[PDB]
Structure 1
Amino acid sequence: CTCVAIIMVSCVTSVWLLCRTRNLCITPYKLAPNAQVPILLALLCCIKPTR
């Protein structure tokens, strides 16, 4: 019970951290549609190509 509990909280906290970073990665580019989205960021903080 403890081990499922600790893996659950760690996994949820990790995914929360990651999705937070995902947002904080895309939003600068999201907001500024006309810039170039660096390829590395494009593939890693995986992104739609905006117009």
Structure 2
Amino acid sequence: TTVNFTVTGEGLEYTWGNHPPKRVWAQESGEGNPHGWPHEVVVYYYNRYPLTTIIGLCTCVAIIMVSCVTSVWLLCRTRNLCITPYKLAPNAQVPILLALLCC
């Protein structure tokens, strides 16, 4: 039979009937390239830290979405306040700087 055991950096001890116990440890030799493109970087950390990488990426996406939504809302709200004083004044000058930064 073929038996596969998971070995971590802590080590694994196995004893085969009447043989002395043997101890082995796993090195951090996972696949990937942490110095390459995002594809290779994520692959390396996923193989080395499966759960932490998944949690990390999900947390980053949540922070990005919350930050982008908040900033887009803040800018949309700001733009309305900037242009509303002129939208209600059909003959207003509408300064060129405001026309470029707000309109």
- Aligning the two structures, in what range does the TM-score lie when normalised by the shorter sequence? 0.7 to 0.9
Residue segments in structure 1 that go unaligned for 5+ positions in a row: 47-51
Q: Provide the rounded CA distance (Å) in 1 between the counterparts of 2:81 and 2:90.
A: 15
By relative contact order (CA 8 Å, sep 6+), the higher-ranking structure is: 1
Q: Provide the rounded CA distance (Å) in 1 between the counterparts of 2:102 and 2:92.
A: 16
Runs of 4+ in 1 over 3 A off after TM superposition: none
Tell which structure's C-alpha radius of gyration is larger. Answer: 2
Aligned residues: 46
Partner residue in 2 for 1:19: 76
Of residues 56, 59, 76 in structure 2, which corresponds to 1:2? 59
Give the CA deviation at 1:2. 0.3
- Report the structure, 1 or 2, having the larger helix content: 1
Q: What are the Cα deviations for residues 2-51 of structure 1, in whole angstroms up to 9, with x where unaligned?
A: 000000000000000000000001100000111100000001102xxxxx
Residue segments in structure 2 that go unaligned for 5+ positions in a row: 1-57
RMSD of Structure 2 on Structure 1 (CA)? 0.5
TM-score (ref. length: structure 2)? 0.44
Identity %: 100
TM-score (ref. length: structure 1)? 0.87
